[PDB]
Symmetry: D2
Subunit: 256 residues, 4 copies
């Protein structure tokens, strides 16, 4: 499943990843739901080990186009995980207080502590994405942020944080179907804003911004994983597989 890890050679091309790809799973939706339940139980036990050992900090970053599956991945992948050891930090439009300090200030505040698993629903990457696409700061400014991000993540990793960054990759036509479904569902209509159509008009600019951010910041200590996410069953299974394998690799143990 290492075909999805972006190597730190700065040669990443987003066109090489197909949102409809399900090739790492030898089966379909029904078999993947059973495989996901097994990974989910392993995840609950690994979180239990993480919290009791109280040494490692785990940061899961989720980035995607609107309707790309950030909310759904949190809901399904972390289903049943002890609320005491899992925390979500969601990053929306910056406030005046947040904009009064550097862009990393509000993000650094939310990092996981020892024994905790934190999920960033959007993150510091927004400062090289919506910021670049909507020209909120000139290129001279946002271009310097790729190095800031690599170095901030290097500091976090060196100091004990296991970092996993997932780009949930959906196609333009899939986003269209999802935004239409969001509009037609009375229990989902609340998620839709008029500004989401303007973000959709800028699809190509966002894909370019994502490709540049991933190419610049996928490192050995903070890898990006590109997740084909047109199939939610595949997205949830693959994210759970990578997360479980990473946590198993920490070789955690209940204290003496």
């Amino acid at each position: 499943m290492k075909k999805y890890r972006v190597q730190p050679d700065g040669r990443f091309e987003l066109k090489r990843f197909d949102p409809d790809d399900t090739s790492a799973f030898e089966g379909g939706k029904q078999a993947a739901l059973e495989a996901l339940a097994v990974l989910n139980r392993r995840l609950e036990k690994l979180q239990e080990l993480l919290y009791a050992e109280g040494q490692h900090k785990v940061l899961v970053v989720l980035q995607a186009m609107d309707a790309g599956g950030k909310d759904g991945t949190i809901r399904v992948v972390f289903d049943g995980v002890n609320p005491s050891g899992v925390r979500v930090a969601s990053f929306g439009v910056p406030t005046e207080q947040e904009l009064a300090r550097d862009y990393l200030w509000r993000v650094h505040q939310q990092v996981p502590r020892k024994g905790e698993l934190v999920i960033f629903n959007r993150s510091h990457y927004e400062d090289v994405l919506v910021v670049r696409v909507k020209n909120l700061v000139p290129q001279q400014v946002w271009q310097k942020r790729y190095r800031h991000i690599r170095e901030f993540e290097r500091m976090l990793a060196d100091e004990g944080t296991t970092i996993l960054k997932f780009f949930l990759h959906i196609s333009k036509d899939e986003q269209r179907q999802r935004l239409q479904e969001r509009l037609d569902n009375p229990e989902k209509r609340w998620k839709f804003r008029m500004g989401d159509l303007e973000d959709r008009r800028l699809w190509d600019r966002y894909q370019e911004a994502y490709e540049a951010a991933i190419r610049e910041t996928s490192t050995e200590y903070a890898p990006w994983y590109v997740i084909p996410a047109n199939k939610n069953w595949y997205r949830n299974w693959l994210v759970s597989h990578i997360l479980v394998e990473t946590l198993e690799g920490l070789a955690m143990q209940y204290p003496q």
Copy 2:
């Protein structure tokens, strides 16, 4: 719901609640597990609605003697509830920074925001529990805190917070068995501290402190519920029942932009 809700008449007596009482449920453990799964699914849907509507703030306070079931209640009652809308704030021994401000400072920091459900694993109630039990501060100091607490909760409720306070009520003998089981379990021992034995000698003083705190602070806008908690199946079912009924009473609507 009615029987376990402490009325704001200042006449609460803890002796009237039996930790082994299971009288609100008829079918026994197996039937309660099935009833709990139905309530859990209703809670998951109510949380999604709370988050979508983004108007109400929900605060669940959990207080209990050590091994009383605070961790287990969070784990079971909120099983499957979307982590995006549920947050736990645990309050342990205050740090020097926290002690440098009033006792409510660290607590107020953690209150739920609009559309969020927050669980306080221990809370501001610790400031009328340990200092009273061990007489670390004079009565003149901690007796004033019942009013501060009623008024802080009145302000939170007036400003949009639905408050539910649960006292998970276990017996002294049940605590003993659980503390021994915690010690004998290699996956649970890490939780056990020597200070837990020191508080056990003070059992009666803690029961009195809890009774007084409940009597003084159970109000219409911030009720206390006494949960018979010697049977975890009953504790989980009853807490889920009260929480679901409360959330339903808010009559939340999905926004229609």
Copy 3:
């Protein structure tokens, strides 16, 4: 100087206080500047003692109409006071994060810690002022806040905070001259906003809101002091006199 403390009898009438009153000081501007310098030196020594002892928490609340002297009082009264023990918390327009919690959440965060002197430049009182005048919440909602405020301040005082609340009282014509001076000074024009002309149009409503707030919340543990503030020399001297006398009454001792 006991005529300026609002007694907790709920009978306060703002019309009884003249913004041009200088009756507590007999010598005039020049003598007041010398008296202020002596109080200022006493204040510097009392702050060093407050910080060294590290037990008391001191909260100074400043409220006034725009151009009423909040910034000038901080600048002059605290001139020379060690920055290590004096902190200003200014409360402006609430952000989305602040509005997502009760109105006291952002305020409680800023309270002084042990050994610290905090000045609130605007405060929790804004939630019974601009809120009441501009009908940002219905009457039922803001009317309940007078009790919340009395009780929040009671808790702070019971738990070790010395509270002083100053209403810097200026006349409508004095505000007009000051806003005009702000506009005509190239080094002050930055402070002026178009919204300040709207707050000026609601003068009478704000005076009624101030009178009601002071009447409802001036208590023994958290007194309001009405400061005639048309003359800055008098305003600075009187606020310094009240503050120094209060701090002296704490009988602070250097630790041994």
Copy 4:
């Protein structure tokens, strides 16, 4: 006055700076007090402008051996500067909550906001000082922190923070006289801790730790200035001179709303 700026060539030697050096000021205490008052009035006006413009963030870092003058520099240099635009963040022994996150977490929380001047009384440098001297983490862990610090400061500077780092340099004999005076003064003995005698015993290890930290982290965007600080009058005058010159170089303008 450029003689005190540590060039970013990684060749800094602490032995080349004498704590008793007063060569940038052509006079003594009395003349320096008058020169300091003129700089102090200029600083008060520059702060009012920094606050009005509301764009630049200013971070002043103070590091020194115990009794080296951190408290006194804040008190004198910022005397009369409007409290609305000046804030001190002091960094002492980390708590369990602070130790549960990376060492930069508690520091980043306190950075200056737009229009604000913040003084760090001790700072993130403690994590390559007391940590290195007392072996609180292995050489393997704290040696990586020189890069983390250079990069954290690069991010702050790129995003609008003007950074000034001052090492207030006192001699070992001067520290002895000051610690004795601290003990003998009833209004200052509250500052005296027994643990300060242990840090004093390790004087040489701390001087080596300071030399290495300054050599590794003095950059063009975040310079270190070595301040001869045995004479308080000289220390206060020189820090004020460097700070004022830096703020004047920003050429801040009062906004003119339309």
